[PDB]
Amino acid sequence: AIDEIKSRGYLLVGLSADFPPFEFVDENGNIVGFDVDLAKEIARRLGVELKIVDMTFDGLIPSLLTKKIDVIISGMTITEERKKVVAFSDPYFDAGQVIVVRKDSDFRPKTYEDLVGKTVAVQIGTTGDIEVSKYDGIKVVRFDKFTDAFLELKRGRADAVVLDSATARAFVAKNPDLVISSGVLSSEQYGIAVRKEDTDLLEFINSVLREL
């Protein structure tokens, strides 16, 4: 709970660093991503250091229950099945994908099925990669970095990009040769898992989330 965190001087956050852009290992060997950014902000507001503990995703709830981590911030959906053994914060992310295409065309795919027979650039390991890859008829082209996927699109070398909605929106705002053609696809919400007895920590986290 909060007393334990402050008395040790650091927040222990468990995650599985194989899920860009939420948690992943960058080219220099650092664990980064949106979940890390959130973890850092929670630690900042507590006034303690952050320690990330990387493990297999199915090891996260076990680790939380043993107290080896204080919280899970790892692309984890809030499900009734997990709620049998842990508590969750309010949702902190509204995960989803959009399809981005060139503006100067009438091609406006609305679903992944509309990309069958097309060439689609994605960032490796992301939800967009995972989803589009499910369709054998989509020609998927994978890139280390989403900026390279967008370059491919802007050059006309791919027909579409699939990416996190907010990231795609931000990129498109700066690149008006592109448009978003879809609404939000592959939507789900993530929450922070906390031990059920650590009520003060849950309350604090929920307060942070409202203030973000």
Side-chain angles (χ1 to χ4, degrees):
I2 293 179
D3 287 351
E4 287 79 15
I5 293 160
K6 292 183 183 176
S7 298
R8 163 214 319 138
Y10 53 93
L11 180 70
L12 288 155
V13 174
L15 55 71
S16 175
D18 64 346
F19 191 46
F22 294 95
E23 47 276 333
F24 66 100
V25 184
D26 75 10
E27 302 181 312
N28 291 162
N30 299 310
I31 296 173
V32 295
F34 300 146
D35 283 341
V36 175
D37 300 332
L38 177 55
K40 285 181 299 184
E41 179 62 11
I42 294 167
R44 185 191 69 81
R45 286 169 171 258
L46 289 163
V48 300
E49 291 189 329
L50 174 65
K51 183 166 169 184
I52 296 168
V53 185
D54 187 25
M55 66 191 75
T56 87
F57 183 92
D58 288 341
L60 290 163
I61 288 173
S63 178
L64 183 63
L65 294 174
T66 74
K67 310 190 179 170
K68 286 292 189 186
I69 57 180
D70 298 311
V71 300
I72 303 166
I73 317 176
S74 195
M76 182 170 276
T77 282
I78 304 167
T79 70
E80 288 304 320
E81 174 195 353
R82 292 172 181 134
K83 289 172 55 170
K84 289 182 180 289
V85 293
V86 300
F88 288 92
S89 70
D90 293 321
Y92 68 85
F93 209 103
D94 283 349
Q97 304 296 303
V98 297
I99 310 175
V100 185
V101 298
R102 293 188 62 254
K103 171 170 176 174
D104 190 21
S105 28
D106 64 4
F107 175 60
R108 293 290 185 278
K110 325 246 143 288
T111 66
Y112 302 131
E113 294 79 351
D114 293 332
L115 301 175
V116 165
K118 305 290 186 191
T119 300
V120 178
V122 300
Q123 179 182 343
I124 197 164
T126 61
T127 296
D129 182 8
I130 292 170
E131 293 298 337
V132 302
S133 295
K134 297 176 187 172
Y135 298 80
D136 56 298
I138 299 176
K139 177 181 176 187
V140 182
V141 184
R142 304 185 179 74
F143 295 85
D144 244 50
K145 337 248 196 166
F146 69 77
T147 286
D148 284 337
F150 282 126
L151 283 200
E152 191 77 342
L153 177 62
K154 289 170 62 71
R155 289 174 68 195
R157 294 163 130 246
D159 302 287
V161 165
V162 177
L163 202 67
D164 172 64
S165 320
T167 303
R169 288 183 202 311
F171 189 90
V172 168
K174 295 176 309 179
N175 288 266
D177 58 337
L178 305 182
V179 71
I180 297 179
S181 60
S182 73
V184 179
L185 304 173
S186 308
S187 287
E188 56 189 352
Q189 292 181 312
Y190 305 141
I192 299 178
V194 301
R195 288 181 292 281
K196 295 186 177 197
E197 65 273 23
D198 284 3
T199 59
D200 62 11
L201 178 54
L202 184 61
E203 290 11 292
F204 180 86
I205 290 170
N206 282 335
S207 294
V208 173
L209 297 182
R210 285 194 287 272
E211 296 189 346
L212 305 178

